[PDB]
Every structure is written in structure tokens, then in C-alpha cells.
Amino acid sequence: GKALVIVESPAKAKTINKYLGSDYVVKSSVGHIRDLPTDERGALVNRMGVDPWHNWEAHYEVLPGKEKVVSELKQLAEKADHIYLATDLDREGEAIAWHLREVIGGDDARYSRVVFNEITKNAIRQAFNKPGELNIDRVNAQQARRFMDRVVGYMVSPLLWKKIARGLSAGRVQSVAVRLVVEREREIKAFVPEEFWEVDASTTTPSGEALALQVTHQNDKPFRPVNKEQTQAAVSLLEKARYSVLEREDKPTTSKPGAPFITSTLQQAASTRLGFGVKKTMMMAQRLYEAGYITYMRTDSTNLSQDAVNMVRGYISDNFGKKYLPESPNQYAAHEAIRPSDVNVMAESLKDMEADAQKLYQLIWRQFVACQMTPAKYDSTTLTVGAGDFRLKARGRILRFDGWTKVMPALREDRILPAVNKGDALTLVELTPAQHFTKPPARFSEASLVKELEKRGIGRPSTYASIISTIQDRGYVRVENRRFYAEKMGEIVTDRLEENFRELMNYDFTAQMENSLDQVANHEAEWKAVLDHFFSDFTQQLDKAEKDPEEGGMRPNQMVLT
Numbered sequence: 001g002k003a004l005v006i007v008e009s010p011a012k013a014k015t016i017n018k019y020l021g022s023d024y025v026v027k028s029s030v031g032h033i034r035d036l037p038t039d040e041r042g043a044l045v046n047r048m049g050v051d052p053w054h055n056w057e058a059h060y061e062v063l064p065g066k067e068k069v070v071s072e073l074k075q076l077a078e079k080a081d082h083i084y085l086a087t088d089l090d091r092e093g094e095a096i097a098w099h100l101r102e103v104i105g106g107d108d109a110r111y112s113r114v115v116f117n118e119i120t121k122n123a124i125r126q127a128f129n130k131p132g133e134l135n136i137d138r139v140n141a142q143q144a145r146r147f148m149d150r151v152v153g154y155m156v157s158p159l160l161w162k163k164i165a166r167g168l169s170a171g172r173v174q175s176v177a178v179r180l181v182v183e184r185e186r187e188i189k190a191f192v193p194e195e196f197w198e199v200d201a202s203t204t205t206p207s208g209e210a211l212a213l214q215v216t217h218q219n220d221k222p223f224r225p226v227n228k229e230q231t232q233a234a235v236s237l238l239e240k241a242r243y244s245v246l247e248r249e250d251k252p253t254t255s256k257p258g259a260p261f262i263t264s265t266l267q268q269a270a271s272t273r274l275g276f277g278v279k280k281t282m283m284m285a286q287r288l289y290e291a292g293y294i295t296y297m298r299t300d301s302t303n304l305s306q307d308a309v310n311m312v313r314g315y316i317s318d319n320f321g322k323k324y325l326p327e328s329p330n331q332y333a334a335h336e337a338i339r340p341s342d343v344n345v346m347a348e349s350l351k352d353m354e355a356d357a358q359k360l361y362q363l364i365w366r367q368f369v370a371c372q373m374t375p376a377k378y379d380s381t382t383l384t385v386g387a388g389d390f391r392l393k394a395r396g397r398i399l400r401f402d403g404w405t406k407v408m409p410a411l412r413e414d415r416i417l418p419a420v421n422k423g424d425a426l427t428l429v430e431l432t433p434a435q436h437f438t439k440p441p442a443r444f445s446e447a448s449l450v451k452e453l454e455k456r457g458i459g460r461p462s463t464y465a466s467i468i469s470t471i472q473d474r475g476y477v478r479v480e481n482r483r484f485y486a487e488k489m490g491e492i493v494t495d496r497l498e499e500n501f502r503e504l505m506n507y508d509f510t511a512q513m514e515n516s517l518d519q520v521a522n523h524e525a526e527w528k529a530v531l532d533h534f535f536s537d538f539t540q541q542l543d544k545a546e547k548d549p550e551e552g553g554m555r556p557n558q559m560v561l562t
């Protein structure tokens with residue numbers, strides 16, 4: 001007589017209940033009900049729980065002390081007329097819904113898989129208005145990923161215990177992430193700082209106003225001495241020269257707001273401006289989503305539905321005015337970006353959320369509102385000065401219309417160059433030479449790394465976070481002073497893998513694996529055939545590595561005596 005809606009958390013169950021009628025009975029499963037344990041070897045297969053030699057037959061099983069919830073669910077299902085699987089919208093979630101249906105059992109007709117990217121009244125309505133079917137192709141792409149990760153972990157690690165040291169761990173993508181940090185460590189250690197100088201000048205305008213200049217050219221060539229003498233000979237010529245304005249360029253510039261956030265950008269901005277580490281940002285964003293305050297937090301699309309765009313433009317014109325509203329909406333390009341659920345709920349009205357979780361909502365709110373507001377206008381100015389065989393420059397800027405910057409904290413902005421006409425005489429007041437120093441490549445951070453991971457097509461919205469925490473507790477890299485450092489062991493294992501598992505360590509290849517997984521999700525490839533090909537390439541590599549080193553196997557971490 002009544003429907004049984006299943007979600008995966010108590011917090012999510014509370015919120016979705018505010019939008020489901022009497023005929024619905026929501027229930028969470030407080031976690032994963034079923035999963036994997038914890039030329040073939042039964043010993044191995046059993047521990048892995050997947051058999052790559054008998055066409056990937058698997059052995060799932062109810063998780064620790066979960067046998068009780070399985071019990072409570074089965075009975076709720078028989079008293080129910082229909083069963084609605086409302087797990088999150090990503091692949092992992094499509095898999096967890098699949099497990100709930102496998103466990104409970106019954107006829108496929110008994111189940112529907114609904115989808116939504118935010119838990120609100122109207123969003124729940126459409127979700128349960130035209131429900132959907134479980135998508136086996138997506139489930140398969142998810143298990144494909146899980147199986148190959150198992151293969152690498154459980155079959156490479158044992159070789160490491162034998163060659164390097166017991167306790168070491170291997171990861172299909174984790175090892176590639178550690179490789180990036182190792183290359184960076186080495187470029188930094190090999191960097192040779194170079195010396196170069198700069199020369200500034202303070203002058204007087206005709207009216208007598210101060211003008212600060214910077215030398216740029218000498219004999220119509222860029223200015224860059226390399227020592228103390230070169231700068232001195234240059235400075236000696238500049239003290240005698242006559243200075244005059246060679247040109248005045250006046251032009252209006254603008255600065256647009258950024259697009260609405262995505263998993264990648266949120267982490268980068270939460271870390272750069274708020275000081276929050278990736279893990280912290282993702283644990284808080286999730287609580288906000290499940291509480292009904294923001295849209296799903298795992299995305300890579302900057303789309304905004306017409307409803308959101310119209311509610312925010314409404315907000316913009318009521319609270320800011322006609323001049324901040326663009327003639328037509330800004331279009332940045334089936335998922336949406338990370339944005340507030342209701343623009344009218346402020347960060348300070350957040351009931352049951354704490355300090356930092358509120359600051360993250362604020363950051364998300366501001367970006368969203370800013371992205372639909374007009375550009376900021378400035379008046380830019382450039383003075384080019386001539387002095388004997390030299391040429392100097394000075395730049396300035398004045399704000400005309402704050403535009404989108406209206407919703408950001410009011411400025412603490414240095415500028416304003418005195419009034420001067422092309423041809424006036426400046427008087428020299430003082431010369432200040434300054435010695436500089438080239439700088440070595442900066443060190444990654446949990447920010448720049450997700451960034452780099454995305455840039456190379458290695459990461460993935462739902463994996464970036466765990467990738468960053470994984471490579472950290474195995475002793476390959478550490479975070480001190482909010483920056484990444486490569487440990488010795490990390491360089492030690494990265495060279496070994498790089499020499500006996502070239503394919504697995506290659507950046508292009510692991511990125512192509514992601515495309516392979518997408519192809520399985522879109523029905524353009526069969527999962528088992530894909531696992532077969534990955535396994536075929538994987539075992540060929542693993543065989544060579546197990547041999548003795550004089551046969552071309554992995555090098556032992558030894559230092560043979562005198």
C-alpha cells in the first residue's frame with residue numbers, strides 16, 4: 001500500500017522526508033550494505049574477492065555487523081508496494097543502489113532509480129514524477145574500476161615487500177600521483193638561482209607631483225644587467241640624461257567574474273582563500289548538500305538551469321540594481337555547478353551548521369551571485385618616458401564601476417599617476433637599483449595537485465579527495481607548511497615502478513583508462529573485455545618484474561659491500 005524510499009544516510013533521510021507524502025516511507029542504510037572482502041592462485045583470488053582467470057567472477061558479502069540492517073530492510077520491502085532507490089547520482093551511487101536491489105531481491109519491476117542534484121521540494125517532485133531504471137552500464141563501469149584497482153593493489157604490493165620493504169602499498173592512480181610530486185621535488189633540488197638586476201626612478205612632473213618609474217629598455221633592447229658593475233655603468237648614464245614623456249596611452253579595461261564552482265575549483269578556492277584542506281572541504285560540502293543547502297558536490301559542469309538563473313537575477317535586481325544586471329544571462333560551458341539551493345538563504349541563517357561550514361557556503365554563495373552580475377570597469381593608463389638611450393614605464397588604474405565586485409569584501413587600491421602630457425619634462429630625484437634572484441618551481445599543495453591532476457585528465461570529481469589522502473599515509477609524501485614534500489621511500493618506489501611498470505606509470509595511459517571507463521558507462525565498450533585487455537598488459541609487466549635483475553627484473557633495495 002505504501003512506497004519504500006531508500007537513501008544511504010540518516011542526515012539525508014531527514015531532509016528528503018520534508019518533501020515526501022504519507023504514502024512514502026524513507027529509510028537509510030547507514031553505509032555500504034555489501035562489498036568486496038576486508039596462471040592463478042586460489043590463495044590470491046579468495047583474498048581479492050574477484051577472479052581474473054575465471055572471467056572475473058566476484059564474491060561480495062554483507063559488511064561487518066551489517067547483517068542486522070539487511071534484516072530490517074527485507075521486511076519493510078514486503079510491506080511496500082514499490083521500492084525507490086534514491087542513492088546519490090554518481091556511478092558509485094548507481095552501484096550502491098544495485099547492491100540494495102541484489103540484497104533485497106525480487107522482481108526488477110519492483111524497483112525504480114530516481115535522480116536529483118539537490119534535495120528541495122521541486123527537485124524531489126520531478127525526481128519521483130518520472131522515475132527511472134537502474135543503469136547496468138554505469139554499475140559495470142564502477143565495478144570495472146574497483147576490480148582493476150584491486151588487481152594492482154594486491155598483486156604489485158607483494159612484489160614490493162619482497163624487493164624493497166614489507167608494509168609498502170601500490171595504487172593504480174595513487175602511484176601516478178606520487179610520481180608528479182617526485183619529479184617536482186627533483187626539479188627543485190636541481191635548480192640553479194640566477195642573478196639579475198632592476199633599476200627604478202622617482203621623478204617630478206611639471207606641476208611638481210611625484211612620478212615613480214621603472215627602466216625597461218636601453219638602446220632599444222630589454223634592460224637586464226647580470227651583475228653589480230653592469231648596473232653601475234647604467235646608473236651613471238641615467239643620472240645625466242634629460243627625462244621627458246614620450247607617450248600617453250589611455251584605455252578602458254574590464255574584469256569579468258569567474259564561472260560557478262566545480263569540485264576542482266571549489267577545493268582550489270577553499271584552500272587559497274579559506275585555508276581549508278581538500279578533505280575538510282569535501283566533508284563539509286557533503287553535509288551542506290545532504291542538509292538541502294547546496295547542489296551535489298561532485299561535478300565538473302558549469303551549467304546553471306533556467307530556474308537558478310532567474311532566481312539569482314531576481315535577487316540581483318532587487319538588492320543591487322539595474323546596472324548590475326546583464327541584458328542576457330551569462331552562459332558558462334545534464335549536471336549543474338555547485339551553487340546555493342535557495343539564493344535567499346544567507347550563510348548566517350544556516351541552522352545546525354558550524355563556523356567553517358558557514359564560511360564555505362558563503363564562498364559558494366558569493367561566486368554564484370557574482371557570476372550573473374556585470375563586469376567591472378576601469379580606466380587604465382600607461383606613461384612611456386624617454387631618457388637618453390633609455391626608455392621607462394609607469395602604469396596606473398582607476399575604478400569606474402565596481403560591477404560584480406560589489407558582493408566581495410570592500411577593498412583594503414594603489415594607483416593614480418600624476419597628470420602629465422606627452423612632451424613634458426620630468427626632473428630626476430633619485431635612482432634606486434635593486435638586485436634580484438630567479439626562483440625555483442613552487443611546491444605543490446593539495447590545491448595545485450588536484451589542479452594538475454585535472455589538467456592531465458587523471459583525476460575525477462569523486463576521486464580527487466581520496467587520491468590526496470591516500471598518497472599521504474603510506475610514507476611516499478608528506479605535507480609540512482601546507483606544501484608537498486617527497487620522502488626518500490617515494491623516490492625509491494617511484495624509480496622501481498618506473499623501470500618495471502612503464503605502462504602503468506605513464507601519464508597518457510592512465511588518462512586513456514579514464515576514457516575507457518567512460519566508454520563502458522555509455523555502452524560503447526563491454527566491461528569484461530576491457531578488464532581482459534588491462535589484465536593482459538598488466539601480467540606481461542608483472543612477469544618481467546618478478547625475475548632476477550640479471551634477467552631484467554626489479555632492482556632490490558640493496559647496497560652490496562666493498
Ligand SMILES: Cc1cn([C@H]2C[C@H](OP(=O)(O)O)[C@@H](CO)O2)c(=O)[nH]c1=O
Nearest residue numbers: 089090091092138298299460462463521
Ligand atoms: C563515481 C564516478 C562518477 N563519474 C562520472 C559518472 C557520471 O556520468 P555518467 O553519466 O558518465 O555515468 C558523473 C556523475 O557526476 O561523473 C566519474 O567519472 N568517475 C567516478 O568515479
